[PDB]
Structure 1
């Protein structure tokens, strides 16, 4: 299968036609996505198979072929880019200044950008092109608009 670093769509043929259920990041031979996209199932890449290696429902993250490799963090001050990969549409960079999710266990960056559910797992990047988290786990605020956490895993 294709192991080149970059952003990938996660597809299924179980439903009508070929449906995009999410997106993920290939980095250092490991595939990174949100748990709710795959539910921890195995994936195919051409004729090859990617087996889950680590996952956590509460973090809503999963890695395949190896441990979670992404460790960059939002600096709390600068604009970032969502590299949105919407279903049936070309990858497109959207620049934004994150907001904050304040929780009892600390603050997390959040991006107020609304894309189809199938865009979950799209990477959020800093100005050096490093992945600071994945888009797709968030909340629906008063006005009905979507705000995603910038979800990042731990590099063991």
Structure 2
């Protein structure tokens, strides 16, 4: 069905009514989302079917119809926009300066914005509108609030 570039809601009719389980990015005929949103399951876009192509539980990423296409990266200095798509609410850009997750394998940018878990998969953008990562995987801090990493996949060849 619909394969136009843009941000999409990931819904389910398994629970009560229509529930939003997450968000995703359609770019170059590939649907990109977080692994914990779909658990690698098949998706529907009208009459059409989207089959998983690549996935990894540790990176918490998954692609549909083709290999991961998003390769933009945070510059480590500039503010970014979370194009948050919350359940039952309109797509909304929120500008913030990301912090840093310091790990044994390197540093990763992190946005300190709290949203309903069904917002996971929402894209984080740079000043050019390029998707530098996805929102939805991070940590819970002292005040009970969430700080998500800027999770980006790898583009092959």
TM-score, length of structure 2 as denominator length: 0.99
Q: Give the CA deviation at 1:46.
A: 0.4
Q: Give the CA deviation at 1:143.
A: 1.3
Q: Give the CA deviation at 1:87.
A: 0.2
Q: Give the CA deviation at 1:39.
A: 0.1
Q: Distance in 1 between matches of 2:96 and 2:76?
A: 12
Gaps of 5+ in 2: none
* 1:21-44 Cα shifts (integer Å, max 9, x gaps): 000000000000000000000000
* 1:5-26 Cα shifts (integer Å, max 9, x gaps): 0000000000000000000000
* 1:102-153 Cα shifts (integer Å, max 9, x gaps): 0000000000000000000000000000000000000001111100000000
May I ask how many residue pairs the two structures share in their alignment?
A: 156
Q: Distance in 1 between matches of 2:100 and 2:7?
A: 25
Give the aligned partner of residue 46 of structure 1: 46
The alignment yields a C-alpha RMSD, in angstroms, of 0.2
* 1:47-73 Cα shifts (integer Å, max 9, x gaps): 000000000000000000000000000
Q: Distance in 2 between matches of 1:51 and 1:126?
A: 29
Q: What secondary structure is seen at the aligned counterpart in 2 of 1:109? A: strand
Q: Distance in 2 between matches of 1:133 and 1:114?
A: 17
Q: Deviating runs (4+, > 2 A) in structure 1?
A: none
Matched, 1:17 2:22: no
Q: Distance in 1 between matches of 2:18 and 2:142?
A: 34
Gaps of 5+ in 1: none
